Design a protein around this ligand. Structure first.
Ligand code: FAD
Ligand code: FAD
Lengths: 328, 328
């Protein structure tokens, strides 16, 4: 049988995969990484899985909220209720606690790992070319290997990366190409001695740092080492896009220490990771993009809010349009 | 000093490369392939180098012509005299004893190979990302390995492969993404026993074929085997894009036999190459695209005519602008 090709296994493509599959259709998932999860990936280091991409997420839509409800039942999601702080020259505790926040149960990557479940997925496969004959669609990866035939194709990557996958639809590529993504430099520090503060999260202004989170406070995270995640602001990340990891570990570690009143020991270890296309620069309404006649559909968080849910909804939408269009 | 980055070693890119280098600025070339030449490269076979991309080229423009006579004196280009015919009302013997044609000396490839010289180059290095810091330019390749710093970047790739390398300049991106490139299936057939026809080239109608050259008629080409290159109409290539090498070799071999009034032994060997982005669908006037303050330039045959000449011009033009901007 000729399945549907989904390029991208972050929550968007995995969302389309479920929709398509629940409606009884066959798909084949592709990703350039070793594994799935995209920007929701978790990293396993000396302190257990650290969450360095998506920090937590909310649910503002009934369907999405539903999905989350399920994942919770299955144990791949819990509620994060950290003591969040703020920064206006000094940490003051904000408490928008009326706001419910969700995280992967053992790690942010657990939601995508469960959504992937048993679907056929080709990993370490960077798709390069997407074309079609009268018949079907075909993918060419970086190794010149051909993949296909495929009935339709769903591009579920960050906009800039989607551009090269859309040469079959110039007009569509043209629009996708205008979507700007902001980068974000993330650093992770792990101390042997828990920092003496009750803080577990922090929205920061006037600092290279935009956000910080006490990773061990997240439900079910290994509590052996105190570990914090630092997220640089986009302007800083942009300005320091080419800086070395250690330099970034130097500066963001510096901004962090410069903002807590207490003492901060020598880190057992520190990691740095640059996300070139972290989140969309602006917000969008598309939901998803397409040329259904042609057979190619486009989705991702940047089609909407640039949040987990946006990404999730964008997938459902692309699937929804594919299914609808099958009435040829 | 920080070298300029040129992505792509087709004539367009080595063209910019020559002008910049001749002016004193160091450059670094990159190409995902093993060797340079792009669409002008020659394929090695048991029949010796075969020209399966650009077949021949004319020099209309005066500067491009100047460059050609210099290459000829260098021994890398020579004139070609193909007895052309036409298949429309049965194959007649229609020719332009007019338009002077040129081909690279040992093989088409000789021209870019000579232009490359000992220029610093990184082969089998596919660039996937091109981003800017506060000062410099950096590139990431498919290995997730960095390259830099670079003072400027010149993208010299077929438009669709450039859209992703233009994330830092969404405005340019959007313009390049809108450019359509037409595919072209190529096939090479070597015959142990020379075909019984006196011709050496031919234009074609009402068939999937479109052009064909007797590769041995070109200057300094191996003699032993009588190799023929056959190019398929763009129209056909599109409908048979997802075709298999075998299917393609089959049909174009069929169509080629179904048009010569002679005896055709089965080939000793046969090759098929699918040039996805063979030629720009339409002509353009741009000359080159760019955002000089950002220090990012884009060039290629598709910025002009879509012929070798335009590629070489676009190359010179892109270099002209980067050099002019060096007025601070
Ligand atoms: C540092 C950071 C912090 C964030 N914090 C939050 C937050 O706190 N709350 C929130 O709601 N959201 C947050 N986000 C955003 C959220 O992570 C994303 O909106 C969401 O994960 C997007 O999912 P996606 O499917 O659209 O894209 P992704 O999951 O990013 O992409 C899917 C896949 O596309 C693959 N791919 C790309 N190109 C190709 C190719 N050519 N061939 C094959 N595969 C390819 C990639 O490998 C990737 O795995 C954050 C993002 C980052 C980076
Ligand atoms: C089948 C065919 C027949 C043709 N016949 C003729 C003819 O008879 N006469 C004529 O005048 N013209 C002809 N042309 C056109 C001519 O070949 C082109 O106009 C010219 O070669 C374009 O050169 P370029 O430098 O602009 O691009 P190219 O030569 O196509 O490409 C340059 C390089 O970009 C590299 N590259 C691409 N993406 C990346 C990346 N992301 N990272 C690193 N490297 C990358 C590629 O590997 C390639 O080596 C023909 C073309 C084709 C394909």
């Amino acid at each position: 049988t000729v399945p549907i090709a989904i390029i991208g296994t972050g929550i968007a493509g995995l969302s389309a995969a479920q929709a398509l599959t629940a409606a009884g259709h066959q798909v084949h998932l592709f990703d350039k990484s070793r594994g799935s999860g995209g920007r929701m990936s978790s990293k396993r280091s000396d302190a257990g899985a650290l969450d360095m991409g998506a920090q937590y997420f909310t649910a503002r839509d009934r369907r999405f909220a539903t999905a989350v409800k399920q994942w919770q039942a299955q144990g791949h999601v819990a509620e994060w209720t950290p003591l969040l702080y703020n920064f206006h020259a000094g940490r003051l505790s904000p408490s928008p606690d009326e706001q419910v926040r969700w995280v992967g149960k053992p790690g942010m990557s657990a939601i995508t790992r469960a959504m992937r479940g048993d679907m056929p997925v080709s990993f370490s496969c960077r798709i390069t070319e997407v074309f079609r004959g009268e018949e079907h669609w075909n993918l060419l990866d970086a190794e010149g290997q051909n993949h296909g035939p495929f009935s339709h194709v769903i591009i579920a990557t960050p906009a800039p990366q989607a551009s090269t996958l859309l040469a079959a639809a110039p007009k569509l590529a043209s629009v996708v190409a205008g979507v700007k993504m902001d980068p974000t430099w993330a650093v992770a520090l792990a101390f042997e001695t828990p920092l003496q503060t009750p803080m577990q999260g922090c929205f920061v202004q006037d600092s290279p740092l935009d956000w910080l989170a006490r990773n061990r406070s997240k439900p079910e995270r290994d509590d052996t080492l105190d570990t914090w995640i630092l997220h640089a602001t986009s302007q800083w990340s942009r300005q320091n896009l080419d800086a070395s990891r250690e330099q970034v570990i130097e500066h963001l570690h510096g901004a962090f220490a410069e903002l807590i009143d207490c003492t901060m020991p020598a880190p057992v270890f520190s990691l740095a990771h640059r996300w070139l296309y972290a989140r969309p620069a602006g917000a969008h309404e598309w939901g998803a993009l397409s040329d259904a006649d042609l057979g190619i559909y486009v989705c991702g968080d940047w089609c909407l809010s640039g949040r987990v849910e946006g990404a999730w909804l964008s997938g459902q939408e692309a699937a929804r349009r594919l299914l609808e269009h099958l009435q040829l």
